[PDB]
Scaffold this active site. Sequence first.
Site, PDB file in Angstrom:
ATOM      1  N   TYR A 161     -41.181  31.298 -10.816  1.00 56.73           N
ATOM      2  CA  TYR A 161     -40.705  32.622 -10.441  1.00 56.73           C
ATOM      3  C   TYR A 161     -39.832  33.159 -11.575  1.00 56.73           C
ATOM      4  CZ  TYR A 161     -39.994  36.745  -7.518  1.00 56.73           C
ATOM      5  OH  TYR A 161     -39.943  38.027  -7.042  1.00 56.73           O
ATOM      6  N   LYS A 168     -34.664  39.966  -9.256  1.00 60.39           N
ATOM      7  CA  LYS A 168     -34.502  40.237  -7.835  1.00 60.39           C
ATOM      8  C   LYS A 168     -33.061  40.077  -7.362  1.00 60.39           C
ATOM      9  CE  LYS A 168     -38.787  41.189  -6.445  1.00 60.39           C
ATOM     10  NZ  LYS A 168     -39.148  42.625  -6.272  1.00 60.39           N
TER      11      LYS A 168
HETATM   12  N1  LIG Z   1     -46.761  39.516  -2.193  1.00 68.16           N
HETATM   13  C1  LIG Z   1     -45.769  38.641  -2.055  1.00 68.16           C
HETATM   14  O1  LIG Z   1     -45.968  37.426  -1.929  1.00 68.16           O
HETATM   15  C2  LIG Z   1     -44.352  39.188  -2.046  1.00 68.16           C
HETATM   16  C3  LIG Z   1     -43.292  38.478  -1.454  1.00 68.16           C
HETATM   17  C4  LIG Z   1     -41.990  38.926  -1.632  1.00 68.16           C
HETATM   18  C5  LIG Z   1     -41.743  40.027  -2.436  1.00 68.16           C
HETATM   19  N2  LIG Z   1     -42.753  40.830  -2.869  1.00 68.16           N
HETATM   20  C6  LIG Z   1     -42.417  42.114  -3.556  1.00 68.16           C
HETATM   21  O2  LIG Z   1     -43.123  43.182  -2.940  1.00 68.16           O
HETATM   22  C7  LIG Z   1     -43.293  44.259  -3.886  1.00 68.16           C
HETATM   23  C8  LIG Z   1     -44.691  44.810  -3.745  1.00 68.16           C
HETATM   24  O3  LIG Z   1     -45.658  43.763  -4.054  1.00 68.16           O
HETATM   25  P1  LIG Z   1     -47.225  43.922  -3.702  1.00 68.16           P
HETATM   26  O4  LIG Z   1     -47.769  42.585  -3.348  1.00 68.16           O
HETATM   27  O5  LIG Z   1     -47.423  45.050  -2.734  1.00 68.16           O
HETATM   28  O6  LIG Z   1     -47.806  44.344  -5.140  1.00 68.16           O
HETATM   29  P2  LIG Z   1     -47.258  44.227  -6.649  1.00 68.16           P
HETATM   30  O7  LIG Z   1     -46.686  42.865  -6.882  1.00 68.16           O
HETATM   31  O8  LIG Z   1     -48.356  44.698  -7.546  1.00 68.16           O
HETATM   32  O9  LIG Z   1     -46.058  45.296  -6.656  1.00 68.16           O
HETATM   33  C9  LIG Z   1     -45.796  46.006  -7.889  1.00 68.16           C
HETATM   34  C10 LIG Z   1     -46.322  47.417  -7.776  1.00 68.16           C
HETATM   35  O10 LIG Z   1     -45.612  48.242  -8.736  1.00 68.16           O
HETATM   36  C11 LIG Z   1     -46.534  48.931  -9.543  1.00 68.16           C
HETATM   37  N3  LIG Z   1     -45.954  49.123 -10.867  1.00 68.16           N
HETATM   38  C12 LIG Z   1     -45.895  48.189 -11.876  1.00 68.16           C
HETATM   39  N4  LIG Z   1     -45.360  48.649 -12.980  1.00 68.16           N
HETATM   40  C13 LIG Z   1     -45.032  49.965 -12.679  1.00 68.16           C
HETATM   41  C14 LIG Z   1     -44.421  50.984 -13.443  1.00 68.16           C
HETATM   42  N5  LIG Z   1     -44.043  50.816 -14.710  1.00 68.16           N
HETATM   43  N6  LIG Z   1     -44.232  52.191 -12.843  1.00 68.16           N
HETATM   44  C15 LIG Z   1     -44.621  52.344 -11.566  1.00 68.16           C
HETATM   45  N7  LIG Z   1     -45.217  51.463 -10.760  1.00 68.16           N
HETATM   46  C16 LIG Z   1     -45.392  50.274 -11.377  1.00 68.16           C
HETATM   47  C17 LIG Z   1     -47.789  48.063  -9.538  1.00 68.16           C
HETATM   48  O11 LIG Z   1     -48.925  48.761 -10.003  1.00 68.16           O
HETATM   49  C18 LIG Z   1     -47.817  47.646  -8.064  1.00 68.16           C
HETATM   50  O12 LIG Z   1     -48.334  48.699  -7.260  1.00 68.16           O
HETATM   51  C19 LIG Z   1     -42.947  43.684  -5.271  1.00 68.16           C
HETATM   52  O13 LIG Z   1     -41.742  44.213  -5.814  1.00 68.16           O
HETATM   53  C20 LIG Z   1     -42.866  42.179  -5.007  1.00 68.16           C
HETATM   54  O14 LIG Z   1     -41.930  41.590  -5.889  1.00 68.16           O
HETATM   55  C21 LIG Z   1     -44.070  40.443  -2.633  1.00 68.16           C
END
Ligand SMILES: NC(=O)c1ccc[n+]([C@@H]2O[C@H](COP(=O)([O-])OP(=O)(O)OC[C@H]3O[C@@H](n4cnc5c(N)ncnc54)[C@H](O)[C@@H]3O)[C@@H](O)[C@H]2O)c1
Lengths: 267, 267, 267, 267
Positions: A161, A168
């Site tokens: 991570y 985070k």
């Molecule tokens: N999926 C899991 O296991 C999990 C668990 C806990 C936390 N999270 C958090 O949830 C959030 C969403 O994750 P997710 O699984 O829906 O997809 P993800 O991890 O792809 O979330 C990132 C999103 O931000 C967008 N992004 C990236 N760079 C960008 C930029 N410069 N400008 C604008 N947008 C940008 C990406 O295209 C994507 O839509 C994240 O912040 C992630 O850390 C996810």
Amino acid sequence: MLLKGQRFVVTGIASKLSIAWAIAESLHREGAQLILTYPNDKIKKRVDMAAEAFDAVAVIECDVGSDESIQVCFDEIAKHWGVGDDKGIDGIVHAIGFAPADQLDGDFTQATTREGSQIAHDISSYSFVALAKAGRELLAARQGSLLTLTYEGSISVLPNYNVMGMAKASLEASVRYLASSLGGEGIRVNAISAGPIRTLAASGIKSFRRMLDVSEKIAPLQRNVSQEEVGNAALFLLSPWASGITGEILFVDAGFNTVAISEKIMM
Amino acid sequence: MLLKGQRFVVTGIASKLSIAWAIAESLHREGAQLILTYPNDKIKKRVDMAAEAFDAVAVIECDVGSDESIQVCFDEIAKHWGVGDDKGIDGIVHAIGFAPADQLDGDFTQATTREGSQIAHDISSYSFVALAKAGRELLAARQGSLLTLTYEGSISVLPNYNVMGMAKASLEASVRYLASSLGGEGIRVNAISAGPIRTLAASGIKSFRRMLDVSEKIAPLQRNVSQEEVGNAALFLLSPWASGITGEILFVDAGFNTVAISEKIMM
Amino acid sequence: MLLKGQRFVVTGIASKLSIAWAIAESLHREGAQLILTYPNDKIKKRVDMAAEAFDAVAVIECDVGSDESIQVCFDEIAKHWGVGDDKGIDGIVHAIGFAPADQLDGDFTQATTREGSQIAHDISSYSFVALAKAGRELLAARQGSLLTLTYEGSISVLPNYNVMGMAKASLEASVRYLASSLGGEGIRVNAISAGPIRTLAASGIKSFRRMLDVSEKIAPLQRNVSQEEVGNAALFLLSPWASGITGEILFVDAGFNTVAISEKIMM
Amino acid sequence: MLLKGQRFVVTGIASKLSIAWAIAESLHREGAQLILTYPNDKIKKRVDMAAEAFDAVAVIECDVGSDESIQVCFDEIAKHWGVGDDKGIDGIVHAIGFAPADQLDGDFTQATTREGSQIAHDISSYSFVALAKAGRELLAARQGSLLTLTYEGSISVLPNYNVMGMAKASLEASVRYLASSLGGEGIRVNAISAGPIRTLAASGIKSFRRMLDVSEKIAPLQRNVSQEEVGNAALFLLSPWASGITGEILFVDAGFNTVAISEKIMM
Ligand SMILES: NC(=O)c1ccc[n+]([C@@H]2O[C@H](COP(=O)([O-])OP(=O)(O)OC[C@H]3O[C@@H](n4cnc5c(N)ncnc54)[C@H](O)[C@@H]3O)[C@@H](O)[C@H]2O)c1
Ligand SMILES: NC(=O)c1ccc[n+]([C@@H]2O[C@H](COP(=O)([O-])OP(=O)(O)OC[C@H]3O[C@@H](n4cnc5c(N)ncnc54)[C@H](O)[C@@H]3O)[C@@H](O)[C@H]2O)c1
Ligand SMILES: NC(=O)c1ccc[n+]([C@@H]2O[C@H](COP(=O)([O-])OP(=O)(O)OC[C@H]3O[C@@H](n4cnc5c(N)ncnc54)[C@H](O)[C@@H]3O)[C@@H](O)[C@H]2O)c1
Ligand SMILES: NC(=O)c1ccc[n+]([C@@H]2O[C@H](COP(=O)([O-])OP(=O)(O)OC[C@H]3O[C@@H](n4cnc5c(N)ncnc54)[C@H](O)[C@@H]3O)[C@@H](O)[C@H]2O)c1
Ligand SMILES: [Ca+2]
Ligand SMILES: [Ca+2]
């Protein structure tokens, strides 16, 4: 019903598997009007489909890496949502994170670089402050809220991570600071810490599938959460039902964060 | 709507000012069937009025100081809610705390006694485990949840809170343990940490009014929360919307717990 | 050297394997005078040997289950340490815990009883407040400190820990409250959260050995801590080097409490 | 005595008022050999005086903003401390933080900028990872430790702390990650969270003096800590006495972090 005539800006929709899609879904289901943003032209396609599924007022570009991009986005939003006596916004959803892939591979000390850390913090943590900044007046006008998505890596080590853990912890600090900075205008600021979610994509990676599996083995409910569980919790926090709640990190992780050693793990 | 055909056991209703009244209210509003409990005959009157206001299936006696009292309560509940293929309970609400008045006056060390501590822990902390024990099979049958009410005194010192601080740390530990013990049956266990609430009664006490006032001065939203804010958060946690959430302490305190020194306090 | 002419009351010495023996050892090594207490006549033998090994000023009876027992203990202590201009005590060490064996076997909900919980809280948590009460004037006279021993079960679930988890959350709350109650007299109050320790006795129990082994597998230093590591950390907290520290929970657990999922665990 | 023949690299000495000066002092007092680093030529003067006061093996340049600067520093260190069978280092002290002054003035949302945040995180948080990276082999060779200095702004809001709050949450995450990454080589990684310290310089600023004063009013010991209290706690954590401790945040803040509302504050 619950969000009838309420307006939300949703970021981070990358596809149907995105937690932000499920968030959008929950919000629409309850009667909300949505503007959705996209970072680039290649992601724009998935956003449009969401626009379709949820009758989006508008689909606006927003690279949270660019202050200029964010400013113009909020200018566009002003023209739908910043005119009239009923001007304002009920929520902004931040569901954006990124770290260079090479930051997240193996030994934290060997893998972490000055630039990857910088990028991780900029996109994953500062970007939320940036949206807060640009949205302030609109949110202020309807006393609406901000919501981000975080993860337990911030406070507890999980392998690979790495610098996202640092990013985070930072983002959760920003939740507390923003809640203090904005609460005088009646703007709430909150986060959900989602558990690991079993997606199509994710199941692709041996190391990820493995982490999913120890999760289910540790978590009290003996499973991983679904996107819809996260979307409904988000719905709650963005709703008038959550008017007494600001500064919260709400764990939607089937109880993982509370266990030290499970009985199932003992072998 | 949201809780149509769902059944909840609510404890701790002492009057119209009780947080548990507001909880009952939120649950009823959303279509739920209630059994309400009362500890003694003199409190029974206020409970009956709640029974009236919310069309209570039943009003049963339950002194959480008596294992025998709890057992018979759950026997009575079995006869409304434990027969048929649709047998079970969707939630149990624990909103009970007590410490001898003399435990909570001035210097923690001088005021705290072996017996007061014992009583505080028994009624405020063990009682939740006790209800979990008696409710297990009914909750198990509908995969329902348990909810308790706590307070920040557990983890942060507030004057005169004293042995209730210890009792609440204990109760929050019990939330974690119960979530682990019960999650295999799909039973969720959660707590809300309510902020200080300005009530009629409470405003009566100079020292309490003072604590309310520094609260508003510290809290990001620059106010104390209302019972209804706590009842709606409780509604959420008892609802299918919270199916991914177990082991949570949800703060409904207008952001108090997140501040170290407010700008307003700086004078 | 470091504790030359300083006086400490040490409780909880049950044998050579006791963490409190190692604490006594560290304190003596650095030039301290000790009074050791014993709960009963059958444990008195092991205490006497400690008295021998460390040139104990005195060996006094103290059942922390009896307020009367505690009072007379502190009366006895007064006669060695409460006369003269140099009257007072530099520290009191609380290293006492107990829960009925049957409270700690299997399912938290099934196993936990009203009385076992009561006993666990009384002996493990209230007893520290009780010693604080009786020691106040002596500690006050030398601005000395109190130290207790806790465990991560308080905040994180471990199997069969059960009601001791609740009792330890309580005891850590008491650390915070006492630090607030006593700090005006320059008395510091602190706790060490020891990691699981591989002892002769403990290695006897299959389930315990197993917990020790997952510990080593999770802990960053890839081992369990030794009693002497805990005794030296205790030495520190009882020493003038720790004069700026009150209210602390110091983890001496080789970093266990900081991991969510180790790479070693991933199989 | 305690650190006889042990070697420490100390950063962040800016003057006699620096916490790192007091740290250096405590380490020297106990028999340690020091290398001190300086960021620039104008700060070099104060470092040299420390070199004088403590018989520094060497005084080497180290801008933690430059990876190249850090690399060459550790090359220089190799030549004193990386030759022979007794090669290695017993500790590295990180006592470096910076945010652009304008990031720390008034409203968090208005004041926080993309670049200031980037700079704060780079110098205050990544730099510790950077020293870990460069020191790994030397620390590994003597199983030595890393120590950083943090602050409660990370987890609790204080006015004008702002983006340093975010940067410190990040740095504390890095402590946890590094402890996991490095513990296999027997390297411990820890942090002290110092309370606000009344210095000459600091007392200069009305707003700072005010924060110092509410601190003393909230803190159980009814005072602010001294640099020497922090240096001795640091001495402890860098010493063999702390061999069982990794991943710890040790608060040396006279108990501040544990209070919600003090009785003194109630007016
Ligand atoms: N999926 C899991 O296991 C999990 C668990 C806990 C936390 N999270 C958090 O949830 C959030 C969403 O994750 P997710 O699984 O829906 O997809 P993800 O991890 O792809 O979330 C990132 C999103 O931000 C967008 N992004 C990236 N760079 C960008 C930029 N410069 N400008 C604008 N947008 C940008 C990406 O295209 C994507 O839509 C994240 O912040 C992630 O850390 C996810
Ligand atoms: N009001 C606040 O400021 C505040 C803030 C945070 C936490 N809380 C918590 O909320 C909960 C509810 O508080 P409230 O303000 O609604 O009223 P309350 O403080 O009276 O709650 C206690 C309730 O438990 C009942 N009770 C007491 N002894 C009992 C026994 N032996 N058997 C059964 N029932 C018994 C009381 O009659 C009362 O209804 C409490 O646990 C309290 O600690 C309240
Ligand atoms: N050993 C571990 O793995 C571990 C880890 C973390 C925490 N701890 C804590 O460390 C402390 C010391 O544990 P230990 O391993 O040295 O031995 P222990 O578990 O036996 O500690 C309890 C001590 O208190 C004494 N005691 C019990 N009832 C008493 C009473 N009524 N009056 C007075 N004294 C009484 C016992 O005789 C014994 O000396 C305990 O509180 C334990 O919870 C130990
Ligand atoms: N003084 C307090 O009230 C207090 C309380 C808690 C935390 N802290 C923390 O303690 C640490 C030390 O603070 P301090 O009061 O001794 O002085 P400080 O705040 O000046 O610490 C920063 C040090 O890092 C140096 N530095 C800055 N930029 C650098 C760079 N690019 N490369 C290398 N070195 C650089 C500075 O010259 C200075 O010596 C800081 O990290 C601070 O956040 C201090
Ligand atoms: Ca929470
Ligand atoms: Ca700690």
